[PDB]
Amino acid sequence: MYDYLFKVVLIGDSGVGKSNLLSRFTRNEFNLSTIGVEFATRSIQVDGKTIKAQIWDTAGQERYRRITSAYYRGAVGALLVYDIAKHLTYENVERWLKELRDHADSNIVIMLVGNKSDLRHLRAVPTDEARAFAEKNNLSFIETSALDSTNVEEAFKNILTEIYRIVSQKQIA
Numbered sequence: 001m002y003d004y005l006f007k008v009v010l011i012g013d014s015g016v017g018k019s020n021l022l023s024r025f026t027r028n029e030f031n032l033s034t035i036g037v038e039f040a041t042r043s044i045q046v047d048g049k050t051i052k053a054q055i056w057d058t059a060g061q062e063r064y065r066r067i068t069s070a071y072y073r074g075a076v077g078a079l080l081v082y083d084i085a086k087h088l089t090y091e092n093v094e095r096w097l098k099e100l101r102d103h104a105d106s107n108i109v110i111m112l113v114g115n116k117s118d119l120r121h122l123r124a125v126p127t128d129e130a131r132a133f134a135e136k137n138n139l140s141f142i143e144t145s146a147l148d149s150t151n152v153e154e155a156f157k158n159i160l161t162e163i164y165r166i167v168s169q170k171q172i173a
């Protein structure tokens with residue numbers, strides 16, 4: 001029973017916490033076997049509507065750039081994740097963002113997610129820097145800790161709400 005079914009993909013370098021964002025949001029689980037791209041669904045309510053989120057994650061193909069255009073196909077949202085404690089994963093955001101815009105559809109809602117906010121002492125990516133990038137690129141932005149749950153619920157509820165608010169206003173085209 002749902003009003004909308006939104007495919008949202010997690011993308012970002014290996015080891016940034018994509019899988020744990022997914023497990024935290026959909027199962028409230030964290031892990032310190034995956035045979036392919038996979039998904040979990042969670043229904044949320046936004047504005048009196050049931051939004052069924054179909055949240056996709058990789059099997060680690062991003063270790064290679066073995067991420068196919070098929071993965072992005074039909075995604076109306078992406079959580080573009082980096083690790084606040086690994087600047088390279090943030091440098092690589094531009095590349096994923098491109099890969100999105102490209103292989104994904106023009107109206108995709110993209111939320112930039114700096115994960116592992118618990119790793120304060122290793123912070124290599126200032127919040128201001130990532131926020132500024134997000135703002136310039138019309139991305140939403142949030143920092144999460146899948147470990148401590150910090151902002152996980154919010155990150156996904158926010159992107160689903162964004163997608164809902166956008167799509168629900170648009171007549172068929």
Ligand SMILES: Nc1nc2c(ncn2[C@@H]2O[C@H](COP(=O)(O)OP(=O)(O)O)[C@@H](O)[C@H]2O)c(=O)[nH]1
Nearest residue numbers: 014015016017018019020031032116145146147
């Ligand atoms: N400290 C900390 N570690 C995390 C967090 N999220 C994920 N990790 C760890 O980072 C590693 C990669 O996590 P994973 O979810 O597999 O990242 P993925 O490769 O992007 O899917 C694992 O050892 C996780 O336990 C977090 O919020 N904080």
Ligand SMILES: [Mg+2]
Nearest residue numbers: 018019058060
């Ligand atoms: Mg993973």
